[PDB]
Ligand SMILES: *[C@@H]1O[C@H](CO)[C@@H](O)[C@H](O)[C@H]1NC(C)=O
Ligand SMILES: *[C@@H]1O[C@H](CO)[C@@H](O)[C@H](O)[C@H]1NC(C)=O
Ligand SMILES: *[C@@H]1O[C@H](CO)[C@@H](O)[C@H](O)[C@H]1NC(C)=O
Ligand SMILES: *[C@@H]1O[C@H](CO)[C@@H](O)[C@H](O)[C@H]1NC(C)=O
Ligand SMILES: *[C@@H]1O[C@H](CO)[C@@H](O)[C@H](O)[C@H]1NC(C)=O
């Protein structure tokens with residue numbers, strides 16, 4: 240939780256301070272990815288640079304698969320705009 | 336100048352009349368002044384100094400074109416102070 | 432100047448605009464002029 | 480995020496003082512960056528003063544384009560400057576029915592001084608180190624019938640307010656070698 | 672009739688739907704009637 | 720003609736040393752200058768100097784008496 244320190248003195252009024260103490264949980268995996276966070280329309284290649292590490296700094300052999308897609312416009316349908324776009328063209332790649 | 340409900344402000348200068356025709360070199364001129372301008376009295380009263388100089392520093396204001404505009408307060412400062420200082424971004428405790 | 436239906440009058444001078452704020456020494460001034468004044472042009476054009 | 484406005488132009492609100500002073504040039508400084516916050520190479524930006532393009536200024540290889548509007552004989556009040564990035568080869572696929580090219584407008588006010596004289600300080604956008612005297616710059620216009628004809632010497636008084644204590648005050652005198660304009664540097668002694 | 676749906680009438684197998692607005696005690700002057708095809712199952716992908 | 724300039728900040732901080740700058744100019748004869756912070760009862764002595772040639776741009780330290788509640792005061 241977040242413990243709070245309070246201090247009363249002859250001159251000060253409240254010396255408040257905060258904690259952020261957390262449960263000491265160590266998930267055995269940690270994946271590091273840095274997305275570009277912004278992509279322009281006239282681009283053809285989206286590069287992902289992914290790594291993954293154990294708790295104690297060890298490489299992790301395994302399969303890394305990425306699936307990226309979206310929707311098209313979702314106008315609303317029926318008395319709005321019945322048939323619209325696609326299910327979103329979803330692509331998929333996998334690597335080792 | 337407003338510190339603890341104390342104005343400390345000297346009274347406004349007398350208001351001139353908007354119909355006294357005055358001659359310059361050419362045509363016949365009436366006086367006027369806009370509500371919002373900038374002068375030495377407003378490059379002070381923002382840093383917070385007090386002047387007592389006799390020399391003219393304050394803008395002259397004509398009747399019918401006073402400050403009005405109720406309380407023209409914009410963002411006024413571009414402050415970067417705050418609290419919370421955290422998004423979700425859970426970087427869980429991952430080291431001994 | 433009107434003699435036998437002939438004006439002989441030079442055309443009126445261009446009209447300035449009533450909103451051009453001009454500075455003198457102190458305050459801020461707009462230009463204006465009365466309809467009826469007296470100048471050299473009406474001190475002549477009466478003698479002829 | 481899939482973005483559409485490839486090019487963006489902004490007014491860095493550190494310089495670009497909001498009050499303009501007659502006879503002192505008004506600086507316009509514009510930041511030009513694209514997509515994920517990167518500087519641009521040589522690009523032209525149009526500085527429209529009221530409704531007329533007058534500037535046509537190129538950048539300085541880091542998106543720091545600086546233009547000097549001449550302010551002498553400006554007796555307006557509002558004087559809304561606008562900068563646009565006009566080039567019929569960009570790709571600006573707008574979405575929210577806005578203008579069709581990057582644009583930004585600043586709305587300034589006019590500084591008053593009855594005899595006619597203006598003092599401006601060219602501010603600093605970087606922090607100043609301790610123990611190093613610094614030379615913040617001041618521009619000045621000092622018109623006729625002001626301080627008094629025949630005297631080619633003017634003294635500016637200098638004041639620094641740290642927290643609420645007036646500290647490091649000074650006096651700087653200048654010789655009016657040229658007619659009426661110039662710039663003089665304060666030996667500001669920044670100390671802890 | 673003016674702002675209230677009163678009829679809700681069905682067609683007659685060839686698109687000739689006929690309704691009879693009752694006019695007794697109308698002392699209005701303009702009385703703009705409007706008809707709409709409301710069924711939240713059809714497709715109206717309008718353009719303009 | 721004599722032109723003068725007082726400079727002290729609008730909010731003095733009780734119990735800490737401050738400064739006050741005065742900028743007398745224009746006079747020719749030697750002059751007598753006094754700067755006083757008129758407290759409730761007591762007078763302060765920021766400047767009590769004889770003024771000697773013109774261009775008297777001088778600025779001194781002065782110590783504000785401690786006060787427990789923010790109060791308006793006058794400077795003469
Ligand atoms: C990606 O995942 C989808 C899941 O439905 C699958 O159908 C598709 O075949 C995968 N991609 C490849 C290249 O196999
Ligand atoms: C200045 O005056 C004009 C007068 O038409 C007005 O449209 C404008 O909003 C005012 N303010 C600015 C910042 O231009
Ligand atoms: C600031 O620039 C002036 C220009 O002449 C120079 O005299 C002064 O030494 C400079 N101050 C520095 C570099 O700290
Ligand atoms: C700045 O002031 C300090 C304190 O009086 C002094 O020691 C230092 O020499 C000054 N700076 C310069 C460049 O003289
Ligand atoms: C002390 O202050 C009083 C006002 O309280 C005023 O007469 C003058 O400034 C000073 N007088 C003496 C005698 O010090």
Ligand SMILES: *[C@@H]1O[C@H](CO)[C@@H](O)[C@H](O)[C@H]1NC(C)=O
Pocket residue numbers: 768769777779780
């Ligand atoms: C104040 O100014 C006077 C002027 O005579 C001077 O003698 C004195 O050293 C200055 N400082 C203090 C703390 O009085």
